[PDB]
Amino acid sequence: GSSGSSGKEETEIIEGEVVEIQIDRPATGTGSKVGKLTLKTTEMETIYDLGTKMIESLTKDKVQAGDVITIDKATGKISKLGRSFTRARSGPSSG
């Protein structure tokens, strides 16, 4: 049919370099396990709110800083990939 064009400039997935992983305890607050994850993507870091299912993923694989993990906003699940190739500016090339 006619409907349809070259677009789809919207993805429900984000992959970054696990910068920091904060975990709030039930000691005080509401109850539902809540945490804060930080990933450096696009020469910029963005904080992500972790619910109760997002944490279980960081635990099963004990995801820590330095590693590279993804985030599925569609289902709200996280997966581990390992490492990645980030392009950084240096200047003087030696090779």
Coordinates of all heavy atoms in Angstrom, one line a residue:
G1 N 0.8 -1.2 0.0 CA 0.0 0.0 0.0 C 0.8 1.3 0.0 O 2.1 1.2 0.0
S2 N 0.2 2.4 0.1 CA 0.9 3.7 0.1 C 1.4 4.0 1.4 O 2.6 4.4 1.6 CB -0.1 4.8 -0.4 OG 0.5 6.1 -0.2
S3 N 0.6 3.8 2.5 CA 1.0 4.1 3.8 C 2.4 3.5 4.1 O 2.6 2.3 3.9 CB 0.0 3.5 4.8 OG 0.3 3.8 6.2
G4 N 3.3 4.3 4.6 CA 4.6 3.9 4.9 C 5.7 4.8 4.3 O 5.6 5.1 3.1
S5 N 6.7 5.1 5.1 CA 7.8 6.0 4.6 C 9.1 5.6 5.3 O 9.1 4.9 6.3 CB 7.4 7.4 4.7 OG 8.3 8.3 4.0
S6 N 10.2 6.2 4.7 CA 11.5 6.0 5.3 C 11.7 6.8 6.6 O 12.2 8.0 6.5 CB 12.6 6.2 4.3 OG 12.4 7.5 3.7
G7 N 11.4 6.3 7.7 CA 11.5 7.0 9.0 C 11.9 6.2 10.1 O 13.1 5.7 10.1
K8 N 11.0 5.9 11.1 CA 11.3 5.1 12.2 C 12.5 5.7 13.0 O 13.4 4.9 13.4 CB 11.6 3.7 11.8 CG 11.7 2.7 12.9 CD 11.3 1.3 12.5 CE 11.6 0.3 13.6 NZ 10.7 0.3 14.7
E9 N 12.5 7.0 13.2 CA 13.6 7.6 14.0 C 13.3 7.6 15.5 O 13.7 8.6 16.2 CB 13.8 9.1 13.5 CG 12.6 9.9 13.7 CD 12.6 10.6 15.1 OE1 13.4 11.5 15.3 OE2 11.8 10.2 16.0
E10 N 12.7 6.5 15.9 CA 12.4 6.4 17.3 C 12.6 4.9 17.8 O 11.8 4.0 17.4 CB 11.0 6.8 17.6 CG 10.8 7.4 19.0 CD 10.4 6.3 20.0 OE1 11.4 5.7 20.6 OE2 9.2 6.1 20.3
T11 N 13.5 4.7 18.7 CA 13.8 3.4 19.2 C 13.6 3.3 20.7 O 14.0 4.2 21.4 CB 15.3 2.9 18.9 OG1 15.5 3.0 17.5 CG2 15.5 1.5 19.4
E12 N 13.0 2.2 21.1 CA 12.7 2.0 22.6 C 13.8 1.3 23.3 O 13.6 0.5 24.2 CB 11.4 1.3 22.8 CG 10.2 2.0 22.2 CD 9.7 3.1 23.2 OE1 10.6 3.9 23.6 OE2 8.5 3.3 23.4
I13 N 15.1 1.5 22.8 CA 16.2 0.9 23.4 C 17.4 1.9 23.5 O 17.6 2.7 22.6 CB 16.7 -0.3 22.5 CG1 15.5 -1.1 22.0 CG2 17.6 -1.2 23.3 CD1 14.9 -2.1 23.1
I14 N 18.1 1.8 24.6 CA 19.2 2.7 24.9 C 20.4 1.9 25.5 O 20.3 1.2 26.5 CB 18.8 3.8 25.9 CG1 17.4 4.2 25.7 CG2 19.7 5.0 25.7 CD1 16.8 5.0 26.8
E15 N 21.6 2.0 24.9 CA 22.8 1.4 25.3 C 23.9 2.4 25.7 O 24.2 3.2 24.9 CB 23.3 0.4 24.2 CG 24.6 -0.2 24.5 CD 25.2 -0.9 23.3 OE1 24.5 -1.6 22.6 OE2 26.5 -0.9 23.2
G16 N 24.4 2.2 26.9 CA 25.4 3.1 27.3 C 26.5 2.4 28.2 O 26.3 1.3 28.5
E17 N 27.5 3.2 28.6 CA 28.5 2.6 29.5 C 28.1 2.8 31.0 O 28.2 3.9 31.5 CB 29.9 3.3 29.2 CG 31.0 2.9 30.2 CD 32.2 3.8 30.1 OE1 33.1 3.4 29.2 OE2 32.3 4.8 30.8
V18 N 27.7 1.7 31.6 CA 27.3 1.8 33.0 C 28.3 2.7 33.8 O 29.4 2.2 34.2 CB 27.3 0.4 33.7 CG1 26.7 0.4 35.0 CG2 26.6 -0.6 32.7
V19 N 27.9 3.9 34.1 CA 28.7 4.8 34.8 C 28.6 4.6 36.3 O 29.6 4.4 37.0 CB 28.3 6.3 34.5 CG1 29.1 7.3 35.4 CG2 28.5 6.6 33.0
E20 N 27.3 4.7 36.8 CA 27.1 4.5 38.2 C 25.7 3.8 38.4 O 24.8 3.9 37.6 CB 27.1 5.8 39.0 CG 27.2 5.6 40.5 CD 28.7 5.6 40.9 OE1 29.4 4.8 40.4 OE2 29.1 6.5 41.7
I21 N 25.6 3.0 39.5 CA 24.4 2.3 39.8 C 24.0 2.5 41.3 O 24.5 1.8 42.2 CB 24.5 0.8 39.5 CG1 24.8 0.5 38.0 CG2 23.3 0.0 40.0 CD1 25.6 -0.7 37.7
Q22 N 23.1 3.4 41.5 CA 22.6 3.6 42.9 C 21.4 2.8 43.2 O 20.5 2.6 42.4 CB 22.3 5.1 43.1 CG 21.7 5.5 44.4 CD 20.9 6.7 44.4 OE1 21.3 7.8 44.4 NE2 19.5 6.5 44.5
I23 N 21.4 2.3 44.5 CA 20.2 1.4 44.9 C 19.7 1.9 46.2 O 20.4 1.9 47.2 CB 20.6 0.0 45.0 CG1 20.8 -0.7 43.6 CG2 19.6 -0.8 45.8 CD1 19.6 -0.8 42.8
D24 N 18.4 2.3 46.2 CA 17.8 2.8 47.5 C 17.2 1.6 48.3 O 16.5 0.8 47.7 CB 16.7 3.8 47.1 CG 16.5 4.8 48.2 OD1 17.4 5.0 49.0 OD2 15.3 5.4 48.3
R25 N 17.4 1.6 49.6 CA 16.9 0.6 50.4 C 15.5 0.9 50.9 O 15.1 2.1 51.0 CB 17.9 0.3 51.6 CG 18.9 -0.7 51.3 CD 20.2 -0.4 52.1 NE 21.2 -1.4 51.9 CZ 22.2 -1.6 52.8 NH1 22.3 -0.9 53.9 NH2 23.1 -2.6 52.5
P26 N 14.7 -0.1 51.3 CA 13.4 0.1 51.8 C 13.4 0.7 53.2 O 12.3 1.0 53.7 CB 12.8 -1.4 51.9 CG 14.0 -2.2 52.0 CD 15.1 -1.5 51.2
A27 N 14.5 0.9 53.8 CA 14.6 1.5 55.1 C 13.6 2.6 55.3 O 13.0 2.7 56.3 CB 16.0 2.0 55.3
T28 N 13.5 3.4 54.3 CA 12.5 4.5 54.3 C 12.1 5.0 52.9 O 13.0 5.0 52.0 CB 13.1 5.7 55.1 OG1 13.5 5.3 56.4 CG2 12.0 6.8 55.3
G29 N 10.9 5.3 52.8 CA 10.4 5.8 51.5 C 9.0 5.3 51.1 O 8.0 5.7 51.8
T30 N 8.9 4.4 50.2 CA 7.6 3.9 49.8 C 7.6 2.3 49.9 O 6.6 1.8 50.5 CB 7.3 4.2 48.3 OG1 8.4 3.9 47.5 CG2 7.0 5.7 48.2
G31 N 8.6 1.7 49.4 CA 8.7 0.2 49.5 C 9.2 -0.4 48.3 O 10.3 -1.1 48.3
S32 N 8.5 -0.2 47.2 CA 8.9 -0.8 45.9 C 10.4 -0.5 45.6 O 10.8 0.7 45.6 CB 8.1 -0.3 44.7 OG 6.8 -0.9 44.7
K33 N 11.2 -1.5 45.4 CA 12.6 -1.3 45.1 C 12.8 -0.3 44.0 O 12.3 -0.4 42.9 CB 13.2 -2.7 44.7 CG 13.2 -3.7 45.7 CD 14.0 -5.0 45.3 CE 14.6 -5.7 46.5 NZ 15.3 -6.9 46.1
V34 N 13.6 0.7 44.3 CA 13.9 1.8 43.4 C 15.4 2.1 43.3 O 16.1 2.1 44.4 CB 13.1 3.1 43.7 CG1 11.7 2.8 44.2 CG2 13.9 3.9 44.8
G35 N 15.9 2.4 42.1 CA 17.3 2.7 42.0 C 17.6 3.7 40.9 O 16.7 4.0 40.1
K36 N 18.8 4.2 40.8 CA 19.2 5.1 39.8 C 20.4 4.7 39.0 O 21.5 4.4 39.6 CB 19.4 6.5 40.4 CG 18.2 7.2 40.8 CD 18.4 8.7 40.9 CE 19.1 9.2 42.2 NZ 18.1 9.4 43.2
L37 N 20.3 4.5 37.7 CA 21.4 4.1 36.8 C 21.8 5.2 35.9 O 21.0 6.0 35.4 CB 21.0 2.9 36.0 CG 21.8 2.6 34.7 CD1 23.1 2.0 35.1 CD2 21.0 1.7 33.8
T38 N 23.2 5.4 35.7 CA 23.7 6.4 34.9 C 24.6 5.8 33.7 O 25.4 4.9 34.0 CB 24.6 7.4 35.7 OG1 23.8 8.0 36.7 CG2 25.1 8.5 34.8
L39 N 24.3 6.2 32.5 CA 25.0 5.7 31.4 C 25.5 6.9 30.5 O 24.8 7.8 30.2 CB 24.1 4.8 30.5 CG 24.3 3.3 30.9 CD1 23.7 3.0 32.2 CD2 23.6 2.4 29.8
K40 N 26.7 6.8 30.0 CA 27.3 7.8 29.1 C 27.0 7.5 27.7 O 27.7 6.7 27.0 CB 28.8 7.9 29.4 CG 29.4 9.1 28.7 CD 31.0 9.2 29.0 CE 31.7 8.0 28.2 NZ 33.1 8.3 28.0
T41 N 26.0 8.2 27.1 CA 25.6 8.0 25.7 C 25.6 9.3 25.0 O 25.0 10.3 25.5 CB 24.3 7.3 25.6 OG1 23.2 8.2 25.8 CG2 24.1 6.2 26.6
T42 N 26.2 9.3 23.8 CA 26.2 10.5 23.0 C 27.0 11.7 23.6 O 26.4 12.8 23.9 CB 24.7 11.0 22.7 OG1 24.0 10.0 22.1 CG2 24.8 12.2 21.7
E43 N 28.2 11.4 24.0 CA 29.1 12.3 24.7 C 28.3 13.0 25.8 O 28.6 14.1 26.2 CB 29.5 13.4 23.7 CG 30.8 13.0 22.9 CD 30.5 12.1 21.7 OE1 29.4 12.2 21.2 OE2 31.4 11.3 21.4
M44 N 27.3 12.3 26.4 CA 26.6 12.8 27.5 C 26.0 11.7 28.3 O 25.6 10.7 27.8 CB 25.4 13.7 27.0 CG 24.1 13.0 26.7 SD 22.8 14.1 26.3 CE 21.5 12.9 25.9
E45 N 25.9 11.9 29.6 CA 25.4 10.9 30.5 C 23.9 11.2 30.9 O 23.5 12.4 31.1 CB 26.2 10.8 31.8 CG 27.3 9.8 31.7 CD 28.4 10.1 32.8 OE1 28.1 10.3 34.0 OE2 29.6 10.1 32.4
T46 N 23.1 10.2 31.0 CA 21.7 10.3 31.3 C 21.2 9.4 32.4 O 21.6 8.2 32.3 CB 20.8 10.1 30.0 OG1 21.1 11.0 29.0 CG2 19.3 10.3 30.4
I47 N 20.5 9.9 33.4 CA 20.0 9.0 34.5 C 18.8 8.3 34.1 O 17.9 8.8 33.4 CB 19.8 9.9 35.7 CG1 21.0 10.7 36.1 CG2 19.4 9.0 36.9 CD1 20.7 11.8 37.1
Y48 N 18.7 7.1 34.6 CA 17.5 6.2 34.3 C 16.9 5.7 35.6 O 17.6 5.2 36.4 CB 17.9 5.1 33.3 CG 18.4 5.5 32.0 CD1 19.6 5.2 31.5 CD2 17.5 6.3 31.1 CE1 20.1 5.6 30.3 CE2 18.0 6.7 29.9 CZ 19.2 6.4 29.5 OH 19.7 6.8 28.3
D49 N 15.6 5.8 35.7 CA 14.9 5.3 36.9 C 14.6 3.8 36.8 O 14.0 3.3 35.8 CB 13.5 6.0 37.0 CG 12.6 5.3 38.0 OD1 11.9 4.3 37.5 OD2 12.5 5.7 39.1
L50 N 15.2 3.1 37.8 CA 15.0 1.6 37.8 C 13.9 1.2 38.8 O 13.9 1.6 39.9 CB 16.3 1.0 38.3 CG 17.6 1.7 37.8 CD1 18.8 1.3 38.7 CD2 17.9 1.3 36.4
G51 N 13.0 0.4 38.3 CA 11.9 -0.1 39.1 C 12.2 -1.3 39.9 O 13.2 -1.3 40.7
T52 N 11.4 -2.4 39.8 CA 11.7 -3.6 40.5 C 12.1 -4.7 39.6 O 12.7 -5.7 40.1 CB 10.4 -4.0 41.3 OG1 9.9 -2.9 42.0 CG2 10.7 -5.2 42.2
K53 N 11.9 -4.6 38.3 CA 12.3 -5.6 37.4 C 13.6 -5.2 36.7 O 14.4 -6.1 36.3 CB 11.2 -5.7 36.3 CG 10.0 -6.6 36.7 CD 9.0 -6.7 35.5 CE 8.0 -7.9 35.8 NZ 7.2 -7.6 37.0
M54 N 13.9 -4.0 36.7 CA 15.2 -3.5 36.1 C 16.4 -3.9 37.0 O 17.5 -4.2 36.5 CB 15.2 -2.0 35.9 CG 14.4 -1.6 34.7 SD 14.5 0.2 34.3 CE 14.1 0.2 32.6
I55 N 16.1 -3.9 38.3 CA 17.2 -4.2 39.3 C 17.5 -5.7 39.2 O 18.7 -6.0 39.1 CB 16.7 -3.9 40.7 CG1 16.5 -2.3 40.9 CG2 17.7 -4.4 41.7 CD1 16.0 -1.9 42.2
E56 N 16.5 -6.5 39.2 CA 16.7 -8.0 39.2 C 17.7 -8.3 38.1 O 18.5 -9.3 38.2 CB 15.4 -8.7 38.9 CG 14.4 -8.5 40.0 CD 13.4 -9.7 40.1 OE1 13.1 -10.4 39.1 OE2 13.0 -10.0 41.3
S57 N 17.7 -7.6 37.0 CA 18.6 -7.8 35.9 C 20.0 -7.4 36.2 O 21.0 -8.1 35.9 CB 18.1 -7.0 34.6 OG 16.8 -7.4 34.2
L58 N 20.2 -6.3 37.0 CA 21.5 -5.9 37.4 C 22.1 -6.8 38.5 O 23.3 -6.8 38.7 CB 21.4 -4.4 37.9 CG 20.8 -3.4 36.9 CD1 21.3 -2.0 37.3 CD2 21.1 -3.7 35.5
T59 N 21.2 -7.6 39.1 CA 21.6 -8.5 40.1 C 22.0 -9.8 39.6 O 23.1 -10.3 39.8 CB 20.5 -8.7 41.2 OG1 19.4 -9.3 40.6 CG2 20.1 -7.3 41.8
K60 N 21.1 -10.4 38.8 CA 21.4 -11.7 38.2 C 22.7 -11.7 37.5 O 23.4 -12.8 37.5 CB 20.3 -12.0 37.2 CG 20.6 -13.2 36.3 CD 21.3 -12.8 35.0 CE 20.3 -12.4 33.9 NZ 19.7 -13.6 33.3
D61 N 23.1 -10.6 36.9 CA 24.4 -10.5 36.2 C 25.4 -9.6 37.0 O 26.5 -9.3 36.5 CB 24.2 -10.0 34.8 CG 23.9 -11.1 33.8 OD1 24.8 -12.0 33.7 OD2 22.9 -11.0 33.1
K62 N 24.9 -9.1 38.2 CA 25.7 -8.3 39.0 C 26.4 -7.2 38.2 O 27.6 -6.9 38.3 CB 26.8 -9.1 39.8 CG 26.3 -10.3 40.5 CD 26.3 -11.5 39.6 CE 27.7 -12.1 39.4 NZ 27.7 -13.4 38.8
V63 N 25.6 -6.6 37.3 CA 26.1 -5.5 36.4 C 26.8 -4.4 37.3 O 26.1 -3.8 38.2 CB 25.0 -4.9 35.6 CG1 25.6 -3.8 34.7 CG2 24.4 -6.0 34.7
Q64 N 28.0 -4.0 36.9 CA 28.7 -3.0 37.6 C 29.2 -1.9 36.7 O 29.1 -2.1 35.5 CB 29.9 -3.6 38.4 CG 29.5 -4.3 39.7 CD 29.5 -3.4 40.9 OE1 30.4 -3.3 41.7 NE2 28.3 -2.7 41.1
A65 N 29.8 -0.9 37.2 CA 30.3 0.2 36.4 C 31.4 -0.2 35.5 O 32.1 -1.2 35.8 CB 30.8 1.4 37.3
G66 N 31.6 0.4 34.4 CA 32.6 0.1 33.4 C 32.1 -0.8 32.3 O 32.7 -0.7 31.2
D67 N 31.1 -1.6 32.6 CA 30.5 -2.5 31.6 C 29.5 -1.8 30.8 O 29.1 -0.6 31.1 CB 29.9 -3.7 32.3 CG 30.9 -4.8 32.6 OD1 31.6 -5.3 31.6 OD2 31.1 -5.1 33.8
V68 N 29.0 -2.4 29.7 CA 28.0 -1.8 28.8 C 26.7 -2.6 28.9 O 26.7 -3.8 28.5 CB 28.5 -1.8 27.4 CG1 27.4 -1.5 26.4 CG2 29.6 -0.7 27.2
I69 N 25.6 -2.0 29.3 CA 24.3 -2.6 29.3 C 23.3 -1.8 28.6 O 23.4 -0.6 28.4 CB 23.9 -2.8 30.8 CG1 23.6 -1.4 31.4 CG2 24.9 -3.6 31.6 CD1 22.3 -0.8 31.2
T70 N 22.2 -2.5 28.2 CA 21.1 -1.9 27.4 C 19.9 -1.7 28.3 O 19.8 -2.3 29.4 CB 20.8 -2.7 26.2 OG1 20.5 -4.1 26.5 CG2 21.9 -2.7 25.1
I71 N 18.9 -1.0 27.8 CA 17.7 -0.7 28.5 C 16.5 -0.8 27.6 O 16.4 0.1 26.7 CB 17.7 0.6 29.3 CG1 18.7 0.5 30.4 CG2 16.3 0.9 29.8 CD1 19.2 1.9 30.8
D72 N 15.6 -1.7 27.7 CA 14.4 -1.8 26.9 C 13.2 -1.1 27.6 O 12.6 -1.6 28.5 CB 14.1 -3.3 26.7 CG 13.3 -3.5 25.4 OD1 12.4 -2.7 25.1 OD2 13.5 -4.5 24.7
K73 N 12.9 0.0 27.0 CA 11.7 0.8 27.5 C 10.4 0.2 27.1 O 9.4 0.4 27.8 CB 11.8 2.2 27.0 CG 13.2 2.8 27.1 CD 13.2 4.3 26.5 CE 12.8 5.3 27.6 NZ 12.1 6.5 26.9
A74 N 10.4 -0.6 26.1 CA 9.2 -1.3 25.6 C 8.7 -2.3 26.7 O 7.5 -2.3 27.0 CB 9.5 -2.0 24.3
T75 N 9.6 -3.2 27.1 CA 9.2 -4.2 28.1 C 9.7 -3.8 29.5 O 9.3 -4.3 30.5 CB 9.8 -5.6 27.8 OG1 9.6 -6.5 28.8 CG2 11.2 -5.5 27.4
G76 N 10.7 -2.9 29.6 CA 11.3 -2.5 30.8 C 12.3 -3.4 31.3 O 12.6 -3.5 32.6
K77 N 13.0 -4.2 30.4 CA 14.0 -5.1 30.8 C 15.4 -4.6 30.4 O 15.5 -3.9 29.5 CB 13.7 -6.5 30.2 CG 12.7 -7.3 31.0 CD 12.9 -8.8 30.7 CE 12.5 -9.2 29.3 NZ 12.8 -10.6 29.0
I78 N 16.4 -5.1 31.1 CA 17.8 -4.8 30.8 C 18.6 -6.0 30.4 O 18.5 -7.1 30.9 CB 18.5 -4.1 32.0 CG1 17.9 -2.7 32.1 CG2 20.0 -4.0 31.7 CD1 18.0 -2.1 33.6
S79 N 19.5 -5.8 29.4 CA 20.3 -6.9 28.9 C 21.8 -6.5 28.9 O 22.1 -5.3 28.8 CB 19.9 -7.3 27.5 OG 18.8 -8.2 27.6
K80 N 22.7 -7.4 29.0 CA 24.1 -7.2 29.1 C 24.8 -7.5 27.7 O 24.4 -8.5 27.1 CB 24.8 -8.0 30.2 CG 26.1 -7.3 30.7 CD 26.4 -7.8 32.1 CE 27.3 -9.1 32.0 NZ 26.4 -10.3 31.9
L81 N 25.7 -6.7 27.2 CA 26.3 -6.9 26.0 C 27.8 -7.1 26.2 O 28.5 -7.9 25.5 CB 26.1 -5.7 25.0 CG 24.7 -5.1 25.1 CD1 24.6 -4.0 26.2 CD2 24.3 -4.5 23.7
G82 N 28.4 -6.3 27.1 CA 29.8 -6.4 27.4 C 30.5 -5.1 27.1 O 30.5 -4.2 28.0
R83 N 31.2 -5.0 26.0 CA 32.0 -3.8 25.7 C 31.4 -3.1 24.4 O 30.5 -3.7 23.8 CB 33.5 -4.1 25.5 CG 34.3 -4.1 26.8 CD 34.0 -5.3 27.7 NE 34.8 -6.4 27.3 CZ 34.6 -7.7 27.8 NH1 33.7 -7.9 28.7 NH2 35.4 -8.7 27.3
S84 N 32.0 -2.0 24.1 CA 31.5 -1.2 22.9 C 32.6 -0.4 22.3 O 33.7 -0.2 23.0 CB 30.3 -0.4 23.3 OG 29.7 0.1 22.1
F85 N 32.4 0.1 21.1 CA 33.4 0.9 20.4 C 33.0 2.4 20.4 O 32.2 2.8 19.5 CB 33.7 0.4 19.0 CG 34.7 -0.7 19.0 CD1 34.3 -2.0 18.6 CD2 36.0 -0.5 19.3 CE1 35.2 -3.0 18.6 CE2 36.9 -1.6 19.2 CZ 36.5 -2.8 18.9
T86 N 33.5 3.2 21.3 CA 33.2 4.6 21.4 C 34.2 5.4 20.7 O 35.4 5.2 20.8 CB 33.0 5.1 22.9 OG1 32.2 4.2 23.6 CG2 32.5 6.5 22.9
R87 N 33.7 6.4 19.9 CA 34.6 7.3 19.1 C 34.9 8.5 19.9 O 34.0 9.3 20.2 CB 34.0 7.6 17.8 CG 33.9 6.5 16.8 CD 32.8 6.6 15.8 NE 33.2 7.5 14.6 CZ 33.9 7.0 13.6 NH1 34.3 5.7 13.6 NH2 34.3 7.8 12.6
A88 N 36.2 8.7 20.3 CA 36.6 9.9 21.0 C 37.6 10.7 20.3 O 38.3 10.2 19.4 CB 37.2 9.5 22.4
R89 N 37.6 12.0 20.5 CA 38.6 12.9 19.8 C 39.9 13.0 20.6 O 39.9 13.2 21.8 CB 37.9 14.3 19.7 CG 37.0 14.5 18.5 CD 35.6 14.1 18.8 NE 35.0 15.0 19.8 CZ 33.8 14.8 20.3 NH1 33.1 13.7 20.0 NH2 33.2 15.7 21.1
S90 N 41.0 12.8 19.9 CA 42.3 12.8 20.4 C 43.1 14.0 19.8 O 43.7 14.8 20.5 CB 43.0 11.5 20.3 OG 42.6 10.6 21.3
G91 N 43.3 13.9 18.5 CA 44.0 14.9 17.8 C 45.2 14.3 17.0 O 45.0 13.9 15.8
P92 N 46.4 14.3 17.6 CA 47.6 13.7 16.9 C 47.5 12.2 16.8 O 47.6 11.5 17.8 CB 48.7 14.1 17.9 CG 48.0 14.2 19.2 CD 46.7 14.8 18.9
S93 N 47.4 11.8 15.5 CA 47.3 10.3 15.2 C 48.7 9.7 15.1 O 49.5 10.3 14.4 CB 46.5 10.1 14.0 OG 47.1 10.6 12.8
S94 N 48.9 8.6 15.7 CA 50.2 7.9 15.6 C 50.0 6.5 15.0 O 50.8 6.1 14.2 CB 50.8 7.8 17.0 OG 51.6 8.9 17.3
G95 N 49.0 5.8 15.5 CA 48.8 4.4 15.0 C 49.9 3.5 15.3 O 49.9 2.3 14.8

